[PDB]
């Protein structure tokens, strides 16, 4: 997946970024755990998009709501990642 | 640009899928008020930024799981049309996952406000 | 309080299903409660106890979802041959990450305290 490599790039960098910076181990945890939290969901979204694909040829509101909600869940986690990182980096 | 157009389309799928989660389910609105209040509550109450995050990240996280549950109940509904007999365990376990996050949020908030207050 | 409370019964009957119907779920399940108790027995910063637990619980919340995914595949892949067998595999992948996070969290957090 090219977008998974696009987000995959986003995640590993952010992890590495949190590591070069000297910061409280607690905050390093929060930075990494926040970005990692995004990584777990995207995979689950990848997991959902996999099942939805297995059954059904046509469009549905029952089918596409699942993908759209799946795409929605990923979005929120990234906001958290953005917000978490913002509030945490605001102090420094 | 054509690498950044892929990202705005995901935002559109997210928005149309969030409002889908929002409108189609009444139970999703009950956590949202709890979450927005608790987030705003966590924002106006003065505490160290790490603790705000932990308060917010617990509260925001409960909301995140519920979205996945809405995604599962959507999938189970799809099989509700192709198949005839549903097992319901997926919905039942999905409902179980949501609970745990709230426990965490409560516990997170309990332990966090106890420490400071 | 009755409109939503049926879900709490749905949680229990769906959890007692998760506990009993799946045997492998108990190996991490035993591990988390231990990890929680351990995190509680250690005298530590309240924030870190949260972080230890919030890290360990995060594994737990996700794993139930894998049980939820593995359930859907079972109704479908009951008599059919799936090319999309990966959905279970992606589910197992998310859990691994959570445990990695937990390990790293506990690794990095316990390094700090000691």
Numbering used by the authors:
A (entry chain C): 28 to 119
B (entry chain B): 4 to 120
C (entry chain A): 7 to 120
Please give me the paper's original passages concerning this structure:
DgkA is a homo-trimeric kinase involved in phospholipid metabolism in Gram negative bacteria. The smallest known kinase, it consists of four helices, three of which are either fully or partly membrane embedded while the fourth resides at the membrane surface. DgkA is a promiscuous enzyme and, in addition to using diacylglycerol as a substrate, it can also phosphorylate the mesophase forming monoolein. Having long served as a model for studies of membrane protein folding, assembly and stability, DgkA was chosen as the test protein.
The structure of a wild-type and a fully functional, thermostable variant was determined recently to 3.7 Å and 2.05 Å, respectively, using crystals grown in meso. The two DgkA constructs gave almost identical results in this study. The renaturation hypothesis was tested by mixing monoolein with a solution of denatured DgkA* dissolved in acidic urea and then bathing the spontaneously-assembled mesophase in denaturant-free buffer. Thus, the simple process of mesophase formation and bathing with excess denaturant-free solvent facilitated a transformation from unfolded kinase monomers in denaturant solution to membrane integral, refolded and properly assembled trimers with full enzymatic activity. Likewise, the refolded wild-type DgkA* was crystallized in meso using 9.9 MAG or 7.8 MAG as host lipids. Crystals in 9.9 MAG diffracted to 4 Å. A complete data set to 3.8 Å was obtained with crystals grown in 7.8 MAG and was used for structure determination. The structure of the refolded wild-type DgkA* is virtually identical (RMSD, 0.419 Å) to the 3.7 Å structure recorded for the untreated, reference wild-type enzyme.
